[PDB]
Design a protein around this nucleic acid. Sequence first.
RNA 1: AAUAGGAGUAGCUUGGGGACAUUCGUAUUCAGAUGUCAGAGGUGAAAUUCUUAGAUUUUCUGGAGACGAACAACUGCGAAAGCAUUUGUCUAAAAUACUUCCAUUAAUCAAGAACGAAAGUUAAGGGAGUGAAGACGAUCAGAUACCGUCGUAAUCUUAACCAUAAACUAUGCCGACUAGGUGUUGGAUGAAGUGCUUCCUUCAGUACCUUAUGAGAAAUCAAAGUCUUUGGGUUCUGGGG
Lengths: 37, 148, 127, 210, 95, 149, 76, 98, 85
Amino acid sequence: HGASRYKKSRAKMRWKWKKKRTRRLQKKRRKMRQRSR
Amino acid sequence: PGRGAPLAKVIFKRTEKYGKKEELIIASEGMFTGQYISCGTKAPLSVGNILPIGKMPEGTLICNLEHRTGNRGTLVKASGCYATVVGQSEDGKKTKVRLPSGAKKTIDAKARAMVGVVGAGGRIDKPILKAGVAHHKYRVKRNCWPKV
Amino acid sequence: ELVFGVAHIFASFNDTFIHVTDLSGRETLVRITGGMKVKADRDESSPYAAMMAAQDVAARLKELGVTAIHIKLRASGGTKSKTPGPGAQSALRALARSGLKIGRIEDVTPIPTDSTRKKSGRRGRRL
Amino acid sequence: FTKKEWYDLKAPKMFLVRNFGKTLVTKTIGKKLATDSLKGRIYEVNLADLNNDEDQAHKKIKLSCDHIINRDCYTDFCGLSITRDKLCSLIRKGYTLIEGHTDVKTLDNYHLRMFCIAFTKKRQNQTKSTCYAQTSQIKKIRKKMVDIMTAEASKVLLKDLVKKFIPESIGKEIEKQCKKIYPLQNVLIRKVKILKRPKLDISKLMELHT
Amino acid sequence: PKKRRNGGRSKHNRGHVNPLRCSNCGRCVPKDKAIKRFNIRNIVDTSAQRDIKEASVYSTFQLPKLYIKQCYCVSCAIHSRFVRVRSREQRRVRK
Amino acid sequence: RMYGKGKGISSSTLPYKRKQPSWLKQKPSEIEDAIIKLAKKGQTPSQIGATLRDNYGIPQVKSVTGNKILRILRAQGIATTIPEDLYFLIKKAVSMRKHLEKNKKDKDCKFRLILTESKIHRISRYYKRKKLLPSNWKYQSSTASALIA
Amino acid sequence: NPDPVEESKKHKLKRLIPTPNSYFMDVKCPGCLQITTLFSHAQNVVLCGSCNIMLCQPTGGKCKLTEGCSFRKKIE
Amino acid sequence: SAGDNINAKLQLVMKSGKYQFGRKSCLKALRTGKGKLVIVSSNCPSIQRSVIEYYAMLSKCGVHDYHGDNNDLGTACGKLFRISCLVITDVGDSDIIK
Amino acid sequence: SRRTKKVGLTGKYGTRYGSSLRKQIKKIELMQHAKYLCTFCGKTATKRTCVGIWKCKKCKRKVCGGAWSLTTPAAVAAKSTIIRL
RNA sequence: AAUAGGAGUAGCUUGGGGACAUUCGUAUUCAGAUGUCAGAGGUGAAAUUCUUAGAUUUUCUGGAGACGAACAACUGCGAAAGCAUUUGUCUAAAAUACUUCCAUUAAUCAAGAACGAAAGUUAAGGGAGUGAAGACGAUCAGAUACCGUCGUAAUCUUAACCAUAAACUAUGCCGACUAGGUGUUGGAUGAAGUGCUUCCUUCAGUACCUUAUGAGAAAUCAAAGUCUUUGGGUUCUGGGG
């Protein structure tokens, strides 16, 4: 999205949930970086 | 070094005779050389004084308790440690105190204890640096180590 | 002449207890809940049950020889609710009907005088 | 159940009826002698029903069992509360609630804790709805209220202090001084508690009971 | 857009107003935001009051009042039919 | 207001007349003598001016004499090197710092101490920009009390 | 229009033309028997010049003066 | 208030009084009988305080207790070293007595 | 000082022992090697000479104290309490 | 000597401003008693759950952690975050007042710094209730959820840290000018209820209501006005998804 958070109009899934998925994903990626390095 | 805290050399003058007599007391925190220490039934309430537990007001902090009168400070001797007076009997004779384990116990009021907390507190807070430091500790303690 | 007891009426909303005692509390006289009188083993709070319990208490007090009661109302724990239970009015009315003599009546419902935390999440119960 | 037996509840010389009822107590057995059961227990006494003025029904006093002979218990004073219904009623919005307290000893060595409430007066000059006092004033009133109360408690014996409580003489004295700081309204002693009521001097207790 | 000028509450010149907990659903809610009803109520109505009075001692005596202070949340107040939703303009018309 | 959210404008407002009171009997020498006595006794110019108006009944020194009191204090050689305002601010900051040394958990005192120190630096920078304050001189956090006593 | 206005003086210290509210008073006290200049909004206790006893009581709103005494207002 | 009031007096004594600080000079001044007022911190040695008080009493000189530290009395007099006790040998603009 | 980035006074330990332990040691050692203000002469020379004992060099005098600092919060509170009563 | 700024002084100015000590109340909970006899808890409706070794219920002692209700508000203070028991101590704060002092000190500010809810981290306490996790009973088509019962980690304090929130007056901050009334909190000025109290006038705060041939896309906004009739000063930010 933009830099600005949420803004549920009709929107999609919960922004906090999207954020949870990305925070969990970034950690998973950080584990891939750990596997690499 | 066997004791966790310092000893204090205290001079009294011989009540039954003449001249100066030296005792070895466990040093309370905030004790100092040239401090005056008072001991007895009619002694004033102040830190490091040695008083029957019956004459403490409740919630006071004390150390060097004895399980019976004149047993000479058998309890509450380790560094930084203290007991709390938690109650005084309604018809007297007994007194209720709290051991540094947190346990409560009832002793006679007549039995003595020493106002305040034992010196060298916080000693356990520093971690043991190394095996040589552990060796130096056991060298003055007991034959007990390496502990396989 | 008159002999006075104290009728504790303890209403949990779920049931309405009638527990009458000596004026000291110590040395009780009748326990009858209201739920003891419920014969269907369901739907525990009932004005009817509270009335029957009161009639039993009155019968027992007449059997004993206590001819009058002072009433202490109490609703639940006051953290749980401030509401008096439904059958409380029934219990009171039954005592009035009984012919036992009704002295001082007081509320002793035990609400908190503070604000310490209680049951369910911060959004509350969703029921 | 098993048998129990009525025993009369007496009240001290200060209370007009002197007989506030009968209590049943379980029949005797070996080594536990029911005297023990009668002794020490507590009774919630509504005051009005002893003196026979319905104005005083807003208080209750607590009475403890302290001396028994045969079928008779004499009883002593142990504490005092206002009834909750009256207290809630007295509390009125738009006015200033002050409550004082102190821990105190009575001439004859009875140790108490005393709780005194006070509301600001409505008066004719308040005009608009807000009649709240300033905080500095209520602190001064609170300090003053405690000072009068501790002076009143300390002076006299226990029976006379109890006698002062009944028409609320202390509240009148508090009101007269504190009116100068700001007008007040119902200034009552909400609760009275004993801290240390003497175990010894049963003889004096019996004499006080008379 | 903004439906409520004050946000449905009273938080002016304040960062936080302490939460109370609801008497009904049990939720935490700020005291200004909270729907508070003082609720002076009588224990029983008329036939009951008559019977208890007759059963009672004392010409003087009359039953205690019930002093509650019952707190409702927004969901609770609509749920139990405590309050209406007014009308958009009328949402500023206090009793 | 410099830091405060508020904006009170309570202040002195002189009369339109800027010349001598009609009833005054004193010459500049008398007013100088009164200033000298108060100054010597240890009063500072605000305290002297307030005293002169209240105790002695004589308003504004600029109207009753040809000169202005800090100037007069300097001219007669009594004057402190440190200004009143800087002295009070340093003392106030020292008071906060002393208090903070005793009690470490006072966040408002720390916030005020930084604010007051910021005002000290501003006043110092102004006095240094003026010919008033030595170039070498500077405020320092903890030596200040000893410095200005 | 604001030029001939007379009722402007009620407002805050800074008006259309700013003015002091404060004034001086010629004061004399029983027993002291002395006449002295004194300031409305003075900030300290003031003693008699004849002897030693106090005259004025200071306060924030003007001055509290004395229970006795007479005070003429100073005019230029 | 009180420590501040004393500090103002000490500031006046520093500025325009004549004073002498520390044990040996203070005793000598008392012995001489030049001293006007002795101001002794409670953080002085018991013995040093006692000697000065005895000397002052003999010489008909007042003693005032200072509440603050020996160091604090030094910073009050604008120095970085402890003073402990001083004797005024000429009164300044200070109000040391009524 | 202007040598190490973050290990400071525990840099003598630096190549040995766990980092968190070195953090814990750093806090204790900072207190341990500090020179305390003496109640019995007003100088900041009071040093620890053995575990429970803190000696002033100048007035040559032994104060009993904590293991790593002059006084525990507990002892101060007790002292204060006794004066209070 | 600025209806700018700073500093001072004055008033039994003010207030849930900050810190430290102190102290009270209550429910709750535990342990010790205390009297009862069959159920008590719990819910859309029940069961899991607890109870004849006496539960729930009554009254009393003693302990413990927790919180500060009702009073209490279109109420106060705070830089913001936030702040409500009692008293004391150490502290700060603004307005009012001033024929007190200074003499432009200022305003907004890249860089940098301080403080910064809740959660999280680490260590010591403490660890009652509440209670992420977790466990059962249901509910139900299934339900790992809502609901019920239990319940560790956490919540609390000290000591470090962490530096984000719809951290929202979704309104940068200072400046002037515009329009009224109803209120309201803190002062000062006058007059009349009985020195105090009231009322009148006036300041700095602070909300609301109505009015805007004022504005705006309208909602609405006395600011979001006085901006194509566009320049009072300045910082920051954005350029379809």
